[PDB]
Short mmCIF file of C-alpha atoms and ligand atoms in Angstrom, two decimals:
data_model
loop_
_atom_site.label_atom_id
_atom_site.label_comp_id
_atom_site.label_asym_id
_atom_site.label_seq_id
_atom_site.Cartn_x
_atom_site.Cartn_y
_atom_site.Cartn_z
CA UNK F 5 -44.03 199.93 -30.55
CA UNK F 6 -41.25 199.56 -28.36
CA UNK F 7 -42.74 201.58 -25.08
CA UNK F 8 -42.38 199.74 -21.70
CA UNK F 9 -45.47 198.70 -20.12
CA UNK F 10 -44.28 197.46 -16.92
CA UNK F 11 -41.19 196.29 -15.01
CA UNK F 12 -41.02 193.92 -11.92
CA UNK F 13 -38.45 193.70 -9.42
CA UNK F 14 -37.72 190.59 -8.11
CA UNK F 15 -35.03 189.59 -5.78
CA UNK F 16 -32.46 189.24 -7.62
CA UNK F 17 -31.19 188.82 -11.50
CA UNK F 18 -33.90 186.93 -13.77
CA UNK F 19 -31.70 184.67 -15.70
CA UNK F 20 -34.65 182.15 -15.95
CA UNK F 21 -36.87 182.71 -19.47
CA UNK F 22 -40.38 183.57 -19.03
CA UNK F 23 -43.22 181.31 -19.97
CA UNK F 24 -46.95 182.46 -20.98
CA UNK F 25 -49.56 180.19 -19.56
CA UNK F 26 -52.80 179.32 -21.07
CA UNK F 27 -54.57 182.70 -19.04
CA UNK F 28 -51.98 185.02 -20.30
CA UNK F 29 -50.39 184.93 -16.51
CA UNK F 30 -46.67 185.29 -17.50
CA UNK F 31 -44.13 182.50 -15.06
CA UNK F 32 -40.39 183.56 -14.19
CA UNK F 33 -37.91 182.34 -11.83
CA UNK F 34 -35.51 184.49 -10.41
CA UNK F 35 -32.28 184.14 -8.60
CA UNK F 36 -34.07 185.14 -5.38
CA UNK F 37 -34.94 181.33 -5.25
CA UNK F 38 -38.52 182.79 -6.36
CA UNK F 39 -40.93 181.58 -9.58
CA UNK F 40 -42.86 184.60 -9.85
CA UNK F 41 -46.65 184.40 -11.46
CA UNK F 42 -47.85 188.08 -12.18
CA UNK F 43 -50.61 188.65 -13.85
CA UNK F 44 -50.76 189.73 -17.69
CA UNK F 45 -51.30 193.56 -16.32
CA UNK F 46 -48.12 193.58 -13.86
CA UNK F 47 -49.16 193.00 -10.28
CA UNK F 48 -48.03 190.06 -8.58
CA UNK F 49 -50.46 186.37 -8.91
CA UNK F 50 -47.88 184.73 -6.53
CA UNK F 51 -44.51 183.89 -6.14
CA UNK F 52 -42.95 180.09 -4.64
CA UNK F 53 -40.32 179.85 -2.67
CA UNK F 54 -37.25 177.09 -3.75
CA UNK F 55 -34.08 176.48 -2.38
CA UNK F 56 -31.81 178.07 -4.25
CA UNK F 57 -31.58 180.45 -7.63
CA UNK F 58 -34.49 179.14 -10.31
CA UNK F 59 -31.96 179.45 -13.35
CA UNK F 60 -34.15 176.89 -15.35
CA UNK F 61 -36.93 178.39 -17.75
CA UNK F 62 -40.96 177.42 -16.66
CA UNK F 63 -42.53 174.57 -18.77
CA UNK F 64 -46.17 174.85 -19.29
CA UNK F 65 -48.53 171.60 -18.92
CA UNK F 66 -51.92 171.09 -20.55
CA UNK F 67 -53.60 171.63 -17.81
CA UNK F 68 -51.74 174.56 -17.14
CA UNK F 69 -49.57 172.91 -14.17
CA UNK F 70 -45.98 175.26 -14.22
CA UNK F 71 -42.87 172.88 -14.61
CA UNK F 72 -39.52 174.56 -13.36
CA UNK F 73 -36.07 173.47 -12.21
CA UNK F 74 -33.90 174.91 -9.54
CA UNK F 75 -30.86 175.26 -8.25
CA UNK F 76 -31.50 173.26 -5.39
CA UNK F 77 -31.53 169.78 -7.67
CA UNK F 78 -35.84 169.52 -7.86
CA UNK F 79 -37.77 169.63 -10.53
CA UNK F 80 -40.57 171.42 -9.19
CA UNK F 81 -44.40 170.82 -10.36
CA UNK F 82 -46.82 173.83 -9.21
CA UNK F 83 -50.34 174.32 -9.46
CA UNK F 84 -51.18 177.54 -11.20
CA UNK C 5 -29.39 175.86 -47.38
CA UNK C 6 -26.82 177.73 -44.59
CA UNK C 7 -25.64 180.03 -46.22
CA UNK C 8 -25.64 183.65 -44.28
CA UNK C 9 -28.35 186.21 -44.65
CA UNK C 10 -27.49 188.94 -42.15
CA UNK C 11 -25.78 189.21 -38.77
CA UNK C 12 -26.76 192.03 -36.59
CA UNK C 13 -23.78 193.63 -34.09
CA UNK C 14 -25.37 194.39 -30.77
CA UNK C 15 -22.66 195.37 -28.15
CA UNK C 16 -21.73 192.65 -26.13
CA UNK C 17 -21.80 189.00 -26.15
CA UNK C 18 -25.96 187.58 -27.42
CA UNK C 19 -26.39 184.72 -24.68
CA UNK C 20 -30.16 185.57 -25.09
CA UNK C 21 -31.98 183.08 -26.86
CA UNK C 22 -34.04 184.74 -29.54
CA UNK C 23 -38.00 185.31 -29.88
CA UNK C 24 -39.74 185.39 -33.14
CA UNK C 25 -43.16 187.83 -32.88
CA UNK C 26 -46.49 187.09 -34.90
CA UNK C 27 -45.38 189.50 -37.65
CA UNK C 28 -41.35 187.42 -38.07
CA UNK C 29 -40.19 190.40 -35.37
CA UNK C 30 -36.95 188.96 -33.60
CA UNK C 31 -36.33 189.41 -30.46
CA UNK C 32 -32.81 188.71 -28.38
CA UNK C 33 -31.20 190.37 -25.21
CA UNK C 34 -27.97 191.07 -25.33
CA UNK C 35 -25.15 191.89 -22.82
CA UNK C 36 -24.91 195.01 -23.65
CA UNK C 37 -28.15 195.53 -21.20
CA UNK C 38 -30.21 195.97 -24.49
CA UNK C 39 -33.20 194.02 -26.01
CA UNK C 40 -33.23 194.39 -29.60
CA UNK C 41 -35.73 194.02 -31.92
CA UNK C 42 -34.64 193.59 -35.19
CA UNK C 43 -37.20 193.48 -38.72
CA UNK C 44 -37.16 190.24 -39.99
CA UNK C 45 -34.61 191.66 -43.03
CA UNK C 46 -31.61 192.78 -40.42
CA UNK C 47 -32.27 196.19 -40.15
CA UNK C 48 -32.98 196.96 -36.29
CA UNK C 49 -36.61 198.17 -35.22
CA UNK C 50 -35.70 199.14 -31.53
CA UNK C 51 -33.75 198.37 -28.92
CA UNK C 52 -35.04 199.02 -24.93
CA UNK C 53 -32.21 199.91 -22.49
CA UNK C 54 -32.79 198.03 -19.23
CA UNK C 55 -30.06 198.39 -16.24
CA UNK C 56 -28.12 195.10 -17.31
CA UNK C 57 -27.11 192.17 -19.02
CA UNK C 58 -30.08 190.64 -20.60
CA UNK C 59 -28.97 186.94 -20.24
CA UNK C 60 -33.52 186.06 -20.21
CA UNK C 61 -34.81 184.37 -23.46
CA UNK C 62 -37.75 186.87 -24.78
CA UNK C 63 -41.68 185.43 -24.13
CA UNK C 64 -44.36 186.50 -26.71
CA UNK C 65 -47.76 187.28 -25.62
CA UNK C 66 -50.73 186.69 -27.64
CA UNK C 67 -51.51 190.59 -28.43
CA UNK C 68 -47.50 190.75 -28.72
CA UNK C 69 -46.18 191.56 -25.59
CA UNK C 70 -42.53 190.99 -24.98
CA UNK C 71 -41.70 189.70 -21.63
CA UNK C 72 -37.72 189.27 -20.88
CA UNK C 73 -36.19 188.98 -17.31
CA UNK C 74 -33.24 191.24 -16.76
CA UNK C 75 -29.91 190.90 -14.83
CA UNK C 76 -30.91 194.35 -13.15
CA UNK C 77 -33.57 191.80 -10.93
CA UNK C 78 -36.65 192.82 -12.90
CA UNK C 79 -39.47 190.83 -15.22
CA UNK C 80 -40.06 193.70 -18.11
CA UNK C 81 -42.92 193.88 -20.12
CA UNK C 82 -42.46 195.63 -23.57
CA UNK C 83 -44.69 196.97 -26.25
CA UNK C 84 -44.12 195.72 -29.10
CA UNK Q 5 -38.66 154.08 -24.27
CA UNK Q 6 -35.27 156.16 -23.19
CA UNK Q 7 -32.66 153.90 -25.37
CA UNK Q 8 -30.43 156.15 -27.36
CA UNK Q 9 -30.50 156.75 -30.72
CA UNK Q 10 -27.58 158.33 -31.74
CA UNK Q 11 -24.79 161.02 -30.23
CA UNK Q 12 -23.34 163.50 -32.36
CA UNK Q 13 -19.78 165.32 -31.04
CA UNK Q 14 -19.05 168.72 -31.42
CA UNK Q 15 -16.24 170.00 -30.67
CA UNK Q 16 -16.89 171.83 -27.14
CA UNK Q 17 -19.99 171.53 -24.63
CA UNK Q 18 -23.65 171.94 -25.86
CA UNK Q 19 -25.35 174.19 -23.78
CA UNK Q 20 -27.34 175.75 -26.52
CA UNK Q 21 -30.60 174.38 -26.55
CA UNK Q 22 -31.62 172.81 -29.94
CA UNK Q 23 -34.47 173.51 -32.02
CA UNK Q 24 -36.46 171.52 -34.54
CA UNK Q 25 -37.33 173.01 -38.04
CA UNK Q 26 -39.89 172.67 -39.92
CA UNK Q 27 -38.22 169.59 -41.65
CA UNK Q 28 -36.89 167.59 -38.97
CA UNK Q 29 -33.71 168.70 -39.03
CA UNK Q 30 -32.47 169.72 -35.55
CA UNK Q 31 -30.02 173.12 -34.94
CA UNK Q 32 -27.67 173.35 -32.39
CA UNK Q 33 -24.99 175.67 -30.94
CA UNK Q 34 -21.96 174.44 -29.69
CA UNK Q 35 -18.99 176.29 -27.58
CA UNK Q 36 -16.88 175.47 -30.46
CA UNK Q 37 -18.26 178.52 -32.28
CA UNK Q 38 -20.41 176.31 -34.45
CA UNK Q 39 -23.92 176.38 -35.56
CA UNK Q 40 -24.72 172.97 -35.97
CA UNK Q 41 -27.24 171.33 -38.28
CA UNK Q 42 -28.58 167.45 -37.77
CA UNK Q 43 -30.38 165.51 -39.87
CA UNK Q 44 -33.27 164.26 -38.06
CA UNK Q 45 -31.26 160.68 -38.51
CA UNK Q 46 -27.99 161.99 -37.04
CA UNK Q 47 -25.85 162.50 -39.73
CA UNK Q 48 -24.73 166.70 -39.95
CA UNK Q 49 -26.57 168.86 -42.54
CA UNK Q 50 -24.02 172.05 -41.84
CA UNK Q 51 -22.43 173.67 -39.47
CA UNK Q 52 -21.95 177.55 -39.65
CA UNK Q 53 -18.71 179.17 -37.90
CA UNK Q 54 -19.48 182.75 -36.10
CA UNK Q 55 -16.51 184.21 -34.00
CA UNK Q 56 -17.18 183.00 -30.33
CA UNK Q 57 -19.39 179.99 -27.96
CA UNK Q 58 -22.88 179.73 -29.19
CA UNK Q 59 -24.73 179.90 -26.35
CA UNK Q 60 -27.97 181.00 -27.41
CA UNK Q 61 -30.48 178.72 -28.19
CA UNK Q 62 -31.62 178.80 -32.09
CA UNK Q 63 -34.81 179.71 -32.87
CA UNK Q 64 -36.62 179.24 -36.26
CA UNK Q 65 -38.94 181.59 -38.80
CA UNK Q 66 -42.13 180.25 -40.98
CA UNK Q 67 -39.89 180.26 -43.90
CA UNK Q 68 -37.43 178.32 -41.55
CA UNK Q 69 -34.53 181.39 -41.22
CA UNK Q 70 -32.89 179.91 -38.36
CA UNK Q 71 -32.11 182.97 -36.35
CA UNK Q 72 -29.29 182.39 -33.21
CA UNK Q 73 -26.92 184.73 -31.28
CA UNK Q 74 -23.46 184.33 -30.65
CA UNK Q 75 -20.95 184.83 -27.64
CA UNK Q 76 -19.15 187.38 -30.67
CA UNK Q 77 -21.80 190.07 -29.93
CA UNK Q 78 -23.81 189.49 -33.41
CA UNK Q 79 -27.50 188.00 -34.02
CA UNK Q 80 -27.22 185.74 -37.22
CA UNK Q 81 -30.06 184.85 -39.53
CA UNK Q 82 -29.16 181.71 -41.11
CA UNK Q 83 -30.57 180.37 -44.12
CA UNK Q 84 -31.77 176.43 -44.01
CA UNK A 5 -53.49 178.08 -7.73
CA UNK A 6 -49.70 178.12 -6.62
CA UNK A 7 -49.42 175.29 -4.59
CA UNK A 8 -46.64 172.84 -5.37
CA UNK A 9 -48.32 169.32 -6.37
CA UNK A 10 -44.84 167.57 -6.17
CA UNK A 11 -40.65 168.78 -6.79
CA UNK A 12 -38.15 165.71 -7.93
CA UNK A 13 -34.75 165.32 -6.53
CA UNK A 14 -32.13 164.89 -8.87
CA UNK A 15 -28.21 164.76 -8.03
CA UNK A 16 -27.45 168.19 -8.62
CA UNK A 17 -28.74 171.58 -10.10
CA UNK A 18 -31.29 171.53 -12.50
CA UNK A 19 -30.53 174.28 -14.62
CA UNK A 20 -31.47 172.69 -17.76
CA UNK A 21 -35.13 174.03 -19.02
CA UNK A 22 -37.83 171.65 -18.88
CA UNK A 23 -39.85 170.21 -22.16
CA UNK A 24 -43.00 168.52 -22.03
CA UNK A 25 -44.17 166.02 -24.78
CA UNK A 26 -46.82 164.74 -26.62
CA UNK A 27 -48.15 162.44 -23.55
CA UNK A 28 -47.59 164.79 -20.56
CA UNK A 29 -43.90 163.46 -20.10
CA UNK A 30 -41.59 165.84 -18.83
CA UNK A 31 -37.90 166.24 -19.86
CA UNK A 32 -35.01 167.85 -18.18
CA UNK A 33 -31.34 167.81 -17.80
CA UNK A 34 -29.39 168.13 -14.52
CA UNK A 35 -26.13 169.21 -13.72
CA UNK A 36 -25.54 164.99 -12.75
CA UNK A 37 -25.36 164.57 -16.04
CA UNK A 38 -28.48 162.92 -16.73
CA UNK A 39 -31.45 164.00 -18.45
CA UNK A 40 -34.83 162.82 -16.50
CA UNK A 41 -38.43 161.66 -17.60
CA UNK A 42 -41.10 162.30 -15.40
CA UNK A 43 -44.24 160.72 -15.65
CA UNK A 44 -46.82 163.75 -15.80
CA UNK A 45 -47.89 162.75 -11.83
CA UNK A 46 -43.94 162.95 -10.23
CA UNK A 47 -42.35 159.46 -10.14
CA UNK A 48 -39.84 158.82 -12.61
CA UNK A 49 -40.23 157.45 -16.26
CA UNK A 50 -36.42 157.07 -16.40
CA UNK A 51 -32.94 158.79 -16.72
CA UNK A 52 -30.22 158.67 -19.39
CA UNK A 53 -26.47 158.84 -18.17
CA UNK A 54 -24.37 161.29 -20.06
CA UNK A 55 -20.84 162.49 -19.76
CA UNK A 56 -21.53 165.60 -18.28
CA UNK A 57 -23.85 168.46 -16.66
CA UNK A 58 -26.83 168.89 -18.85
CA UNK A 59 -27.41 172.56 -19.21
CA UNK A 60 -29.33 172.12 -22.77
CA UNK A 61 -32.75 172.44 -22.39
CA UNK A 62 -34.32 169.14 -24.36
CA UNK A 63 -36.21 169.90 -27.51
CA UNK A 64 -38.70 167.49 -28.57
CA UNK A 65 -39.68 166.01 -32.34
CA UNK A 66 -42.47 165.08 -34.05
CA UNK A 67 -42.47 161.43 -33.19
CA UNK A 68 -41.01 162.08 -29.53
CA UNK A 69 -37.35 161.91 -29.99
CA UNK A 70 -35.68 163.84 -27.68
CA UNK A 71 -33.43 166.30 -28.27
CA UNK A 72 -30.63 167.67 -25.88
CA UNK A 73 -27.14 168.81 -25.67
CA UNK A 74 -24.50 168.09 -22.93
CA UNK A 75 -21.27 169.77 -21.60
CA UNK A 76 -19.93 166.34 -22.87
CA UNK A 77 -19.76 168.27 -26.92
CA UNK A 78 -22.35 165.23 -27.83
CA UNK A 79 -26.14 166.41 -29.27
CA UNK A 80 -27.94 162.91 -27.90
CA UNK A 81 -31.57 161.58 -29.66
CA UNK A 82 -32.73 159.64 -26.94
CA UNK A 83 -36.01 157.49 -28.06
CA UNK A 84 -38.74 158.37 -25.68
ZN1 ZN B 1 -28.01 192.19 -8.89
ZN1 ZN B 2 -29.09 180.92 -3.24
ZN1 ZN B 3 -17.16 189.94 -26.27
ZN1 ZN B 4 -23.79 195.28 -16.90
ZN1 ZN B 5 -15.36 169.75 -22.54
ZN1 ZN B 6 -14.22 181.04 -28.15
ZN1 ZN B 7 -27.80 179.75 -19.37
ZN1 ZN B 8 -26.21 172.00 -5.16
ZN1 ZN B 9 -19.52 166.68 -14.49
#
């Protein structure tokens, strides 16, 4: 309807576009060097640590592995 | 064909990439610290005032959930 | 097997992401203000001019409304 | 779970957002102008020279061709 349902601050600005995995658990980098997992409901599932700003957008594997890019030149491969 | 059906002026430059909802709902972020979501004939539906530039592509959760990073450091989670 | 298949120039840099219709054919936003529509072969289908860079990435409807935002502050709905 | 399970160095930012097709290969851009293919387990499937920083996010067809701009004005098909 158009009624927020919950913000979350991370570090710094969230340029990277969030991806939905499998479980609903929603995947964003931010420029705090951070991907962020939080859980469908709002609270924090975990967050990794890069090496620089995570400008690129999470990819989502079959089995739900979390494929990212950073600033830092990796591609990054996570475990949920 | 490519022929035009509708633009839709939001106030500053669209570098959002746009979301399309279960019902044909788009949603885009736009500078102007605004994501809009516009019915699927060009006439707006809302628009959700964060604290800046939405440069984050909209996500689209299975009940229809928008989630959207913001320049303002925070992951937002919209009804929809 | 990563050998090319074919480039196709625009007239500034690509950073729009494409997207792939329902068809095959594959849309594209260039800096040059352009739309830009691709045979799946590599030979253009269209190109639409808005005012500024597309930046935004297109994204696509089920009746395949192609649906993109533009560095000129307007969302566009673009028919095939 | 959240732990990382491998990252890939390319030659410079990886802002490009990753795409992951029909077989588990995973496709992204970096800012050394080549797009990468990583097999699904982290070592390299191969890399396609460009002219310039790949900030397009690759989209991916029906039979695999893959789809990505480049600051270089070219939209590349790159077989897979
Ligand atoms: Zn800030
Ligand atoms: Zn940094
Ligand atoms: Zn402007
Ligand atoms: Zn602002
Ligand atoms: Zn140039
Ligand atoms: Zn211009
Ligand atoms: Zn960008
Ligand atoms: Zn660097
Ligand atoms: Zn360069």
């Amino acid at each position: 309807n158009g009624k927020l349902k919950w913000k979350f601050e991370t570090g710094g600005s969230v340029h990277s576009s969030p991806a939905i995995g499998q479980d609903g658990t929603i995947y964003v980098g931010s420029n705090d060097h951070y991907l962020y997992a939080i859980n469908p409901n709002g609270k924090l599932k975990w967050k990794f640590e890069t090496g620089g700003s995570v400008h690129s957008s999470p990819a989502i594997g079959q089995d739900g592995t979390i494929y990212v890019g950073s600033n830092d030149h990796y591609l990054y491969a996570i475990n949920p």
